[PDB]
Design a protein around this nucleic acid. Structure first.
Ligand SMILES: Nc1ncnc2c1ncn2[C@@H]1O[C@H](COP(=O)(O)OP(=O)(O)O)[C@@H](O)[C@H]1O
Ligand SMILES: [Mg+2]
Lengths: 788, 754
DNA sequence: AGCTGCCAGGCACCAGTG
DNA sequence: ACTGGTGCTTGGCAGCT
């Protein structure tokens, strides 16, 4: 509680506070000898989070300074505890030599670990992307950018309204979200993880243009298709600024940025994504999703690509025909290709570490093991006549020169780190073999000296050993210690042994340690040199990884189509969906009865189906599976049906029934087009009897007669089956059921026309409502049916 | 590690921690399971470090897993329903062991709180009651029999423990229970002709004894809960009223978050029991009421003193099991010190019950004085290293400590002696496991060491030595300290011998202190929260004047609107129309909370409540299948003494189907069951019910259109609603104007037929 | 094969001679 | 201003049983 002016502090705390001032809201690991230290509330916080001791560094002038810390070699385990709780940590290191330093040794922050910029294998999940995003809002729209720092994939977009922006955050699921201080729609964003408020000036348009061109080495961003997009460039500017500030090295794997137009994909609202269960079931988990079914990729990078595709269907007809083509060609070849692709591993993330210069020995080894599969894949894919498959074979590369480089440079199975040597192999550098060979009197020399001195002295307890603190020694037991040569100079004393040193053992100590250190310092120069020779080829290597990943997805999708009995869909010119014996791709796996296949005929003249049928009749499944088939068709995949013809689809909307249901419904009515697939599931709620139904009725009318979209409209309201009569483009279908005394069977089959009756009382009876009460409700019911 | 597999065979159905240096190790399916539950990794290995073991045990026991520890041999086992250690328990949450079993007649159920020794027994008549007892009691560990049909009752539950059929034999269960209690028969606890419940209680106690391998002398009694003794609340109702736990599985915005301002964790747990088990016997209720009125003026004085009494109940458990640690005894002493101050404060209270608690609370001045002398002010966590017995308690101990201190003082002066005598300013005297005492000199000065010094250990920058003088006094220190430590331990075990004869009385005290905590709390809650004392009538009825929902009114900073209620046998059912938006559901839910609180003996949020007998409370308030299943249960089980609250049934099916069931339900509830009922509905067509039959009236909620919004009033008014608001809400949400115009047209067309 | 306690190394603090 | 001791976080492992 003293006045903590600059002069009141020790030279050390002056330096620590300037560094902390650059990172005021986040934890600062501050290298001091063998320990990262934290101070003040960082220490206190660290103590709770990491479960380490909160103590004090003593102080002559005033208050003791709260302190905690960890040994430098245990850091990665502590970084993991933090990043999993969404915490950033600024890592500070000693740059200077203490012996040539008057005051405190020079200290820089060299890195900042944040949830969205982590690239180490230990902190990531193999099969999930981990993205950094930036968001900003004008009075008019949103800018959004994402970056996979462990792949270079750098994207820009401009969502026009609240609900697309929501859909975009849902889809990309950023691990860390940078946002502007003036952001108005905080409902999209509060209660997200890795939330990071930024000042407005980081989203300035001129600085982003300048920094992105600098990064890409371009004059303008014309070539990238984003010069057009200031809204998005602003968020991209911030993102890149934050990415540079965390890593504090060059980032040469970020060579490109791509715009994501609304026209290029099918925009699925937030409800659609949740209700289709693409990678997340409605109960939060990852089981019984569409990905649980379709995803038997064999590489991490492949699984991450497949999930991105599921999530972003493409509209380019050419790309889709190329994908389908590939899938049909490789059908026979999946048993041969999968085991081999598996061995390539996560080459994508390894190349990120190569680019960041963080790549460990076992990354280089696994890169080598990937290069070694290329020829078998090249040979396996030659046979396959498919122009798209050959284009991937070509992009996949070979890198025989680099494969040999790593085969000669690094041993078969190196250790986890370079810190303690034993990575570079014999023959690679002859100066190293000479330095290493001097540090191999460890075998012969020391032992011949033991024997020799034991026999010369006659003292049978005499041994030669080493310890790190006192060095090489000759040990005699305490019983015999008094008979040792008077030449033996004393070095270390123990309870029951005395240890000594002689000029010849000292001479050997001095050469083994100065040559072990020189063998390490050359080995680390040589290993950092491996980066120099690999890095020039990084562009080709990244293209290669993406080719293998694509190959893995497409090989998987081919194998899926065979095993799960799927067909190739075709595309038509105008809106419409014709399905023959289609199935819910997920429900038909997780369900131990037969799945009843069902057709669907949707067109511009038959654009709205009023779906009826009893509760648990199959109404929602029918809708979901329609959308899932649409989705699977539009990633390029074969589809769970006897046959599918499908027209263009711009957006998919879903409403699954307070103020929220009506607002959602309004967004649909405002943004759906003749090309949209609209799924309304028992909407329309009011405070009285017909209140809610009248809204649903007017809504349907607007969808049918003014919007002309392709709507599926499940209802409990039998009154809506009068709609086809009155309204062009509308028709009735129902889910079939059979009554037969005290019971009801759900047939799960779509028929044309309205249900003959509604089965609410039958469902009530099934649920256990007393027979006497159902007797009375049927009586009442007939009174009502007699009105008309 | 063939040693691991054969120890795993010893207890194959239980997880097995297996010691390895710093860690406990789990292999095979043990590892799989444990990484799933604890957020740790695989290798099929899994490691849990030694310094944190108690923590990981507490999680696994919280999740229904027994654990075996192994140091080779299985030395210790923790089962979820039999722990009494403080680190393994949650202060304000009960933790029961339970046993269920089925007969060709009906169910048998028993529960034990192993800390308090509260032992219960029941004989649920059908499966629904049984399911309601399982939700209510939420046992940490459930014993069941091999021959058990109704597995859907207990399928999903944690802590399941399949047991042989012979473990439920009646004659063996009687003998064991009568041994446990010092009785020849069970007539005195009122359970001697309840054989099914006894069979469950026999298995539970066998199992409890087996987990402990100790007498359980604090289990001296068993009580039988009865159907008619309490207000039955099925699981759905219990969850809907948000008594201890909210709908999101939390502790906030719940009846306990407002009512439970108790000051000891033992009284908190007792209040939560009271809330989940409303009693019907108005005698007991009338006593709690009188007590809450009489204690009003004594609340501020009592609660600070009561607070200091602490969780005496659970400490007493560890006295019974002989695991109490020094701070248990200190906390227990600290609580004895409060008894005089509580006796004085309560003496003046005009209440027979408060005075009966005040006696039952006791004094224990001899035990207070014993622990004042025996133990120091703030003893360490463990007895293991001593420093727990205070000076003056034992003459032998004091003398051993004095010779220790003097041998220790001599070695301090030996340091100063040697240090001035040699002139070497770095000379000190350390102690060590390996070398005992030693003299240290720094490496720079170590060559000036006296010739009599004997090197034992070189360090990087010092040298340590013994002389025989060091060794001589070292002997005096370690022997004296060791005699003192053996004596502290024996004197500490002697405290258990002096306390335990008074255990029956101590348990009575803690139980009384807990009740008082609760009543003093409810008394302060009535005065602070403007509650009133409800009166009981002889026939079904609820008259509320200006009643409120006790949670909603403390939580939301919008003014709470109070409402009347008038249910009698001539006015059994209200049809409630108008917008919902939480207003209807709150009025229904506050009715149930007021009934519940009345039948806990608490005061209630109102100006006046009169209330007849209630046997059951049903609230269907929140698929169409789930709505109908809950409705079926109401219709099958409700009586003329029941309170039924229904939230717009008929939603999720056709208009005419949902209207037909609604009308049939209302009609059945009014003309057959005759239950007191609040029937919320959107069907305007149901407002004709009052014209067709006696006992039914219409009430409603309106809204108010103003400015650019709508204000949904929470005032219940006589008569039917004359307005719908679904289209106005659509308009406000931005549904295009032309669409609303059409819906307005369609709505008129639809209602005008009707 | 378990337990204890020195050590890793920057820095400030501190107390004994200039 | 200086020589030479001590203190401080956790994890590794030497030096004891
Ligand atoms: N075509 C089908 N074949 C077999 N089972 C089906 C089929 N469609 C639906 N089901 C099953 O019936 C259940 C009810 O489906 P659902 O679409 O939710 O009915 P609804 O929405 O009309 O109430 C689903 O859980 C699913 O398992
Ligand atoms: Mg449905």
């Amino acid at each position: 509680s003293a006045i903590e002016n600059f002069d009141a502090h020790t030279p050390m705390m002056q330096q620590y506070l300037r560094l902390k001032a650059q990172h005021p809201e986040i934890l600062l690991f501050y290298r001091m000898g063998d320990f990262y230290a934290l101070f003040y509330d960082d220490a206190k916080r660290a103590s709770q989070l990491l479960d380490i001791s909160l103590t004090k560094r003593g102080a002559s002038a005033g208050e003791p300074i709260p302190m905690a810390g960890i040994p430098y070699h245990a850091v990665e385990n502590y970084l993991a505890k933090l990043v999993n709780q969404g915490e950033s940590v600024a890592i500070c290191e000693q740059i200077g030599d203490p012996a040539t330093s008057k005051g405190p040794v020079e200290r820089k922050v060299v890195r900042i670990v944040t949830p969205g910029t982590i690239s180490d294998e230990a902190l990531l999940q193999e099969r999930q992307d981990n993205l950094l995003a930036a968001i900003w809002q004008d009075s008019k729209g949103f800018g959004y950018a994402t970056l996979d720092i462990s792949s270079g994939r750098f994207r820009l977009s401009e969502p026009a309204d609240r609900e697309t922006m929501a859909a975009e955050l849902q889809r990309t699921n950023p691990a860390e979200l940078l946002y502007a201080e003036d952001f108005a729609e905080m409902s999209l964003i509060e209660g997200r993880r890795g939330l990071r408020r930024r000042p407005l000036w980081e989203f300035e348009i001129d600085t982003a243009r300048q920094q992105l061109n600098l990064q890409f080495g371009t004059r303008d961003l014309v070539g990238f298709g984003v010069e057009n997009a200031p809204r998005g460039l602003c968020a991209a500017g911030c993102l890149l600024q934050y990415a540079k500030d965390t890593q504090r090295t060059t980032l040469p794997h970020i060579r490109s940025i791509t715009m994501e137009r609304e026209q290029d994909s099918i925009i699925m609202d937030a409800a659609t994504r949740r209700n289709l269960e693409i990678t997340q079931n409605l109960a939060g988990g990852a089981e019984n999703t569409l990905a649980s079914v379709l995803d038997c990729t064999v590489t991490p990078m492949g699984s991450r690509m497949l999930k991105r595709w599921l999530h972003m269907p493409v509209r380019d007809t050419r790309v889709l025909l190329e994908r389908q083509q590939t899938i049909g060609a490789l059908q026979d070849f999946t048993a041969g290709l999968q085991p081999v692709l598996r061995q390539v591993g996560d080459l994508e993330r390894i190349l990120a570490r190569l680019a960041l210069r963080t790549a460990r020995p076992r990354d280089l080894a696994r890169m080598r093991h990937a290069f070694q599969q290329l020829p078998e894949l090249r040979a396996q894919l030659e046979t396959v006549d498919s122009a798209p498959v050959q284009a991937l074979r070509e992009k996949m590369g070979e890198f025989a020169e680099l494969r040999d480089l790593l085969e000669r440079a690094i041993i078969d199975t190196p250790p986890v780190l370079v810190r303690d040597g034993g990575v570079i192999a014999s023959g690679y550098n002859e100066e190293l073999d000479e330095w290493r060979a001097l540090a191999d009197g460890a075998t012969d020399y020391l032992e011949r000296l033991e024997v020799r001195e034991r026999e010369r002295t006659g003292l049978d307890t005499l041994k030669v050993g080493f310890n790190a603190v006192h060095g090489y020694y000759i040990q005699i037991s305490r019983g015999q210690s008094h008979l040792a040569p008077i030449n033996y100079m004393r070095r270390q004393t123990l309870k029951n042994a005395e240890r000594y040193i002689i000029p010849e053992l000292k001479e050997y100590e001095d050469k083994v340690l100065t040559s072990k250190g020189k063998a390490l310092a050359l080995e680390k120069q040589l290993y950092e040199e491996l980066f120099d020779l690999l890095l020039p080829h990084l562009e080709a290597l990244q293209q290669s990884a993406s080719a293998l990943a694509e190959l893995d997805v497409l090989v998987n999708l081919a194998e899926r189509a065979y095993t799960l009995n799927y067909t190739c869909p075709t595309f038509i010119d105008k809106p419409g969906i014709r399905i023959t014996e289609g199935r819910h791709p997920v429900v038909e796996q997780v369900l131990n009865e037969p799945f009843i296949a069902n057709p669907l005929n949707l067109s511009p003249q038959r654009r709205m189906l009023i779906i009826t049928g009893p509760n648990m009749g199959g109404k929602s499944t029918y809708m979901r599976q329609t959308a899932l088939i649409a989705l699977m068709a539009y990633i390029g995949s074969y589809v769970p049906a006897q046959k599918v013809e499908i027209g263009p689809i711009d957006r998919i909307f879903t409403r699954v029934g307070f103020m929220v249901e009506m607002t959602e419904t309004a967004n649909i009515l405002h943004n759906a087009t003749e090309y949209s697939l609209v799924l309304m599931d028992e909407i329309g709620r009011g405070t009285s009897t017909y209140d809610g139904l009248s809204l649903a009725w007017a809504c349907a009318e607007n969808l049918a007669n003014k919007i002309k979209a392709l709507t599926l409209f499940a209802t409990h309201y039998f009154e809506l089956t009068q709609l086809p009569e009155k309204m062009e483009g509308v028709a009735n279908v129902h889910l079939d059921a059979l009554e037969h005394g005290d019971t009801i069977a759900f047939m799960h089959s779509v028929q044309d026309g309205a249900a003959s009756k509604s089965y609410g009382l039958a469902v009530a009876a099934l649920a256990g409502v007393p027979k006497e009460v159902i007797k009375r409700a049927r009586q009442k019911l007939r009174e009502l049916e007699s009105i008309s």
